[PDB]
Structure formats: structure tokens, C-alpha cells
């Protein structure tokens, strides 16, 4: 089916503000064939109700064996993860790490996350001119530092994830993203082998042991896929929640003032950051196992479907006055972390990081503000991730 719109042709204007386009589409129907800025042809599902339903609908699979579109060699190497599986494989894989990310288990990481944030912020505050780029100084370093310590990724090996992730989000090429994947995949395999038999206590070491104890519970391919998903799934997302959220807060002085006046509104503010400018613009690939009809529009089986969480969050019927960033707004039911069996397992960790980061910036940066007109900001064209290239800020 030919695309009705080529998102790439819309340019940076769409990347910066995609909402009007999604809403115009929603006004004419729930499903639309489009071409992403990358060149991929997929279906977009818009509207909160339809989005929510599709996310949990078992008729839409995440197993590539149900996609008419073949996986590339590199992707086929990291495909065996819970997010790209259906029950029972998904059920088995998720159980292996579910207990690791509960709210109570994550709470024990507060002291260390707080140290990391205080460290990064104080380093940022060393700027002789009271200016810095929040992405480079805090948004990017925080999540990678936290997850690497949890998984056991050596400090020296983290710089490479900077370049690799930039390739995944913001290429320069189709090809390039694949190259980055092959590189990272190769690295993960070597990191896993370096753990085997070393008696480490980090999560990756424990997973390696789990795989060695029972290859049926976690195969070599699934072990590699687990390392991949735990590193990727929470990196780019958390990074952009922090940057996007602060951008939202700093571009709405009234909300900043409100949070300043009552820090107990912090948790609600982070939830509205997810609703208003969540990092996941469109969910990961879903494939109908059978032809599915959405309000008259039939999506053929095997086709690629992207649920546009960004649009669901701007649906008036569900979030009144959607264009307004209101930190005290009712956010119950948002889909920023997904919905259904694939609901984010790292949500408590992401919230811990964001809440601690947001508070530190507000309590230690006197007169914190954006140091650039918003029209000068550059947003990623990637269909799944909503994010900035940089976020220049200033303080007294
Ligand atoms: C602000 C940060 C985060 C956001 C907005 C986010 C969002 C999401 C979303 C939308 C999904 C579902 C995607 C879909 O259904 O297509 C998901 C799945 C997942 N996320 Fe997160 N995530 C974040 C942080 C994390 C962190 C910190 C971890 C690390 C533990 C993580 C690990 C995962 C995993 C493993 C899954 C797969 C769940 C499954 O398939 O059962 N996420 N996340
Ligand atoms: C928590 C949701 C994150 O998504 C994922 O973890 C999934 C499993 C993932 O890693 C893929 C969606 C990647 O997206 C793309 O990767 C390219 C190299 C190939 C491309 N292909 C389908 C055309 C597509 O799979 C992931 C590396 C994407 C980047 C931008 C990312 O970090 C997003 C993460 C969340 C959406």
C-alpha cells in the first residue's frame, strides 16, 4: 500500500512539532500508511482509545516471525528479547528479570543515583559562564552510568554507546544504523564471554549463570538479546525523558514556578512530562497475525504497525486541553510506558532517575532557564524516539 504521507519530506518542522500532523490524521481515521524519515513504510495508529487497545491486542504480534518484512542479519542477532516476543517466550523471558526492577528493589539504588546526579550537576555548575548543554552534562551520562553499574559494563566501554546510540537515533544512514548494531552486538557478545566463570555479582553475570545453568530457560541468543534490551530500552528513553521534561518545564515558567513552590508535586510533574513530551513517540513494531480492521481500514497481516503514543496523549477526550503542560493534571492511564503484557519493566528505575535529576536541577541551579530560542533547537527525525540534539541552559 502506497504511503499517504512521507514524513521525511516534511523535514525538521515535523520532527520539531509532529502533533498537528498526527491530529489531522486522527480526524480522518485510526490507521494510516506512511513512510518514516528513514524510508520505512509502516502503518500509524492514532487516537488514545485505539492506541491503548492495539498495544494490548494479542492480534498484533511483536514476534518477527509474523512480519512480512525480513530482519537484517544484524537485527536477527538481537531479536530474541522479551519485547520482540509473544507468550510463552515473552512470559519466560520477562520472569527472569521482573523481580530486579520492582519499586522496592529500585528504591535501594537511590543513594547511588543521588550521588551520580549530584556529581554530574556539580560538574556542570563548574561552567565559568553559567552555561551548559543539559544533554551532554546530565541527560546522557546519568542513565548510561546507572544501567552500566547495574549490568556490569566497564566504564571505558561506555563511550562507545554514545556514538552507537547516535547512529540508532540520528543517523546519516540506513546503513550506518546497521553498522552500529553489528558493532554493539559484537561487543555485547565479548562482554558476556568476559563474565563467564568470573563469579561476578552484577546482573549480566547472574544472567550468564542462569543461561549456563539451564540453556532452555535462557539460550545464548536470548542471553545476548537480554543484555541488548536492558541496555537499549532504558537508555535513549530515560535520556530523553530528562531532557524533554526539563525543556517542557523551562519553556513553561508558570509550571516551573508551581513546582518550585511545592516540590511535593514532583512525582506528578514527571508523569506530565511523560504525557506531554514522552520520549517514545511511537511504540515498537507490531505485526497483525491476521488482517485487522480498524474503523473500516484493514491492515494486512504481516504489515508493520506503529502505535503513536504521542498522539494518544494529545487526544482531547482523554486529556482535556492536551496542548497544555499542567504538572497537576490527571495523568492516570497514559501510555508513555506502554500498556499490556509488554508494559515497561524499568518504569520504577526511570522514574527514580528522572525525579532525582529534576529536583537536583531546580534546587541547585539559581534562575535556571533555556539559553536558546526553541526555534533554534534540533529534534530527532526518528519515528520512535522524540528527542533533542542538545539543550542549552543557563543559570545565575
Ligand atoms: C523514561 C524511560 C522509559 C520509557 C518512557 C520507557 C518506555 C517503554 C515502553 C513504551 C515500552 C513498551 C514498548 C511497546 O510496547 O512497543 C517499554 C518496554 C520495556 N522497557 Fe522501558 N522505558 C523506559 C525505561 C526503561 C528502563 C530504565 C529499563 C531498564 C530496566 C527499561 C526496560 C524495558 C524492557 C525490558 C521492556 C520490555 C518489556 C516487555 O516486553 O515485557 N525501560 N518501555
Ligand atoms: C523501550 C522501547 C525502546 O525500543 C527497543 O528497545 C527496541 C527493542 C529496539 O531496540 C528497536 C526498536 C531499535 O529501533 C531500530 O533499530 C535500528 C538499528 C533498526 C530499525 N529497523 C526496524 C528498521 C529499528 O529496529 C532501537 C535500536 C531504536 C533506537 C532509536 C532506540 O533506542 C529506541 C528505543 C525505544 C523505542
From Swiss-Prot:
Transmembrane segments: none annotated. Substrate binds at residues 84, 177-181, 228-236. Heme binds at residue 344. It comes from the Bacteria. Keywords: Antibiotic biosynthesis, Heme, Iron, Metal-binding, Monooxygenase, Oxidoreductase. One of its GO terms (biological process) is macrolide biosynthetic process. The keyword Oxidoreductase applies. It catalyses: narbomycin + 2 reduced [2Fe-2S]-[ferredoxin] + O2 + 2 H(+) = pikromycin + 2 oxidized [2Fe-2S]-[ferredoxin] + H2O; narbomycin + 2 reduced [2Fe-2S]-[ferredoxin] + O2 + 2 H(+) = neopikromycin + 2 oxidized [2Fe-2S]-[ferredoxin] + H2O; narbomycin + 4 reduced [2Fe-2S]-[ferredoxin] + 2 O2 + 4 H(+) = novapikromycin + 4 oxidized [2Fe-2S]-[ferredoxin] + 2 H2O; 10-deoxymethymycin + 2 reduced [2Fe-2S]-[ferredoxin] + O2 + 2 H(+) = methymycin + 2 oxidized [2Fe-2S]-[ferredoxin] + H2O. SUPFAM superfamilies: Cytochrome P450. One of its GO terms (molecular function) is heme binding. Pathway: Antibiotic biosynthesis. The keyword Chaperone does not apply. Pfam families: p450. Its EC number is 1.14.15.33. Its cofactor is heme. Disruption phenotype: Abolishes the production of methymycin, neomethymycin and pikromycin and leads to the accumulation of their precursors. Belongs to the cytochrome P450 family. Catalyzes the hydroxylation of narbomycin to give rise to pikromycin, and of 10-deoxymethymycin (YC-17) to give rise to methymycin and neomethymycin during macrolide antibiotic biosynthesis. In addition, produces low amounts of neopicromycin, novapikromycin and novamethymycin. Requires the participation of a ferredoxin and a ferredoxin reductase for the transfer of electrons from NADPH to the monooxygenase. This is Cytochrome P450 monooxygenase PikC. It comes from Streptomyces venezuelae. The gene is pikC.
Amino acid at each position: 500500500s502506497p504511503p499517504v504521507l512521507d514524513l521525511g519530506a516534511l523535514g525538521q518542522d515535523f520532527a520539531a512539532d509532529p502533533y498537528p500532523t498526527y491530529a489531522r490524521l486522527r480526524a480522518e481515521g485510526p490507521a494510516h500508511r506512511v513512510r518514516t524519515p528513514e524510508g520505512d513504510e509502516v502503518w500509524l495508529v492514532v487516537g488514545y482509545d485505539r492506541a491503548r487497545a492495539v498495544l494490548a491486542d494479542p492480534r498484533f504480534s511483536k514476534d518477527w516471525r509474523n512480519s512480512t518484512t525480513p530482519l537484517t542479519e544484524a537485527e536477527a542477532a538481537l531479536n530474541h528479547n522479551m519485547l520482540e516476543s509473544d507468550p510463552p517466550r515473552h512470559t519466560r523471558l520477562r520472569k527472569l528479570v521482573a523481580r530486579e526492577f520492582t519499586m522496592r528493589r529500585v528504591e535501594l539504588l537511590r543513594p547511588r543515583v543521588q550521588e551520580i546526579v549530584d556529581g554530574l550537576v556539580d560538574a556542570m555548575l563548574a561552567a565559568p559562564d553559567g552555561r551548559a548543554d543539559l544533554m551532554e552534562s546530565l541527560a546522557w551520562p546519568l542513565p548510561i552510568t546507572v544501567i552500566s553499574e547495574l549490568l556490569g559494563v566497564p566504564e571505558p566501554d561506555r563511550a562507545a554507546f554514545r556514538v552507537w546510540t547516535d547512529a540508532f537515533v540520528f543517523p546519516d544512514d540506513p546503513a550506518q544504523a546497521q553498522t552500529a548494531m553489528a558493532e554493539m552486538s559484537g561487543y555485547l557478545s565479548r562482554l558476556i564471554d568476559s563474565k563467564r566463570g568470573q563469579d561476578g555479582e552484577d546482573l549480566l553475570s547472574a544472567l550468564v549463570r542462569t543461561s549456563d545453568e539451564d540453556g532452555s530457560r535462557l539460550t545464548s541468543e536470548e542471553l545476548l538479546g537480554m543484555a541488548h534490551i536492558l541496555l537499549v530500552a532504558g537508555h535513549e528513553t530515560t535520556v530523553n525523558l530528562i531532557a524533554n521534561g526539563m525543556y517542557a518545564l523551562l519553556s513553561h515558567p508558570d509550571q516551573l514556578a508551581a513546582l518550585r513552590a511545592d516540590m511535593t508535586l514532583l512525582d506528578g510533574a514527571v508523569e506530565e512530562m511523560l504525557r506531554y513530551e514522552g520520549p517514545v513517540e511511537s511504540a515498537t513494531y507490531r505485526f497483525p497475525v491476521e488482517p485487522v480492521d480498524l474503523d473500516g481500514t484493514v491492515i494486512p497481516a504481516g504489515d508493520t504497525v506503529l502505535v503513536v503514543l504521542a498522539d494518544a496523549h494529545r487526544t482531547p477526550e482523554r486529556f482535556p486541553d492536551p496542548h497544555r503542560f499542567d504538572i497537576r493534571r490527571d495523568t492516570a492511564g497514559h501510555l508513555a510506558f506502554g500498556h499490556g503484557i509488554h508494559f515497561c519493566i524499568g518504569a520504577p528505575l526511570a522514574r527514580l532517575e528522572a525525579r532525582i535529576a529534576v529536583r537536583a536541577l531546580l534546587e541547585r541551579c539559581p534562575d535556571l532557564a533555556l539559553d536558546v530560542s526553541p526555534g533554534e533547537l534540533v529534534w530527532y527525525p526518528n519515528p520512535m524516539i522524540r528527542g533533542l540534539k542538545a539543550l542549552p541552559i543557563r543559570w545565575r
